[PDB]
Design a protein around this ligand. Structure first.
Ligand SMILES: [Zn+2]
Lengths: 116, 141
């Protein structure tokens, strides 16, 4: 859709669950399109700045997650097509990861980048 | 398994190229002339050319036709072997972490190793830990 594409290249971040790359306005006005019932980052900025971080690199134009090699390698085949990242560094605090396991969402480290 | 192709781009317009072709795809996915691309890779460490995913070489030529940012490398589309689909996604150590060690580019303490203390959430300025090297206003006039 037209909502998953970042409007402006300035002030864009990437989530740590599905690696959604969008502008800071879309994460506040709409939020995470791939997870809205477990995260609830629409309507505020503290939650947007808590889970989603600016420290990320790599951009991919995901269009057909059901048939693509890069989608399977990043385990983003069950997500919505759109702007994604290949290495989103960081870790969630111990305040939102405990509820995801009780709700059946396995938070996986999307940082596929190597350290030294 | 879809194939990966390499196209040449303008130097300094990689993210613009990606954000333009994604909007082209969304603007032509419902017409009679859709795009056969799966995804376009634009690494941040590279500068000068990008990558595109398509099964055959005709699809990329029929998809990148009409864009002024990919008109130069339009007459040739190289192909990488199957073992280079993995080395593209590798990133070596974003780059924003507190209590780390960074260096300056401009100012007086050029190429001097420093330390980070606090990060402003506004993405405007960043705190730094350095040591002054001034004379305390004794030598200079
Ligand atoms: Zn996500």
């Amino acid at each position: 859709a037209l909502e998953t594409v970042p409007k402006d290249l300035r002030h864009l971040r990437a989530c740590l669950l599905c690696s959604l790359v969008k502008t800071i306005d879309q994460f506040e006005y709409d939020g995470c399109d791939n997870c809205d019932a477990y995260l609830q980052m629409k309507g505020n900025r503290e939650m947007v700045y808590d889970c989603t971080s600016s420290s990320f690199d790599g951009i991919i134009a995901m269009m057909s997650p059901e048939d693509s090699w890069v989608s399977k390698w990043q385990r983003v085949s069950n997500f919505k097509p759109g702007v994604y990242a290949v290495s989103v560094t960081g870790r969630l605090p111990q305040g939102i990861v405990r509820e995801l396991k009780s709700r059946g969402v396995a938070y996986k480290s999307r940082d596929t980048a190597i350290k030294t | 398994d879809p194939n990966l192709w390499t196209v040449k781009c303008k130097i300094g317009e990689e993210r613009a190229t990606a954000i333009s072709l994604m909007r082209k795809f969304i603007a032509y996915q419902f017409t009679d002339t859709p795009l056969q691309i799966k995804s376009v890779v634009a690494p941040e460490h590279v500068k000068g050319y990008i990558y595109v995913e398509a099964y055959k070489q005709t699809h990329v030529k029929q998809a990148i036709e009409g864009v002024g940012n990919l008109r130069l490398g339009y007459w040739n589309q190289q192909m990488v072997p199957i073992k280079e689909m993995t080395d593209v996604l590798k990133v070596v150590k974003a780059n924003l972490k507190p209590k780390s060690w960074v260096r300056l580019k401009r100012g007086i303490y050029k190429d001097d190793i420093a330390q980070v203390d606090y990060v402003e959430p506004s993405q405007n300025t960043i705190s730094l830990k350095m040591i002054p090297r001034i004379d305390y206003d004794r030598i200079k006039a």
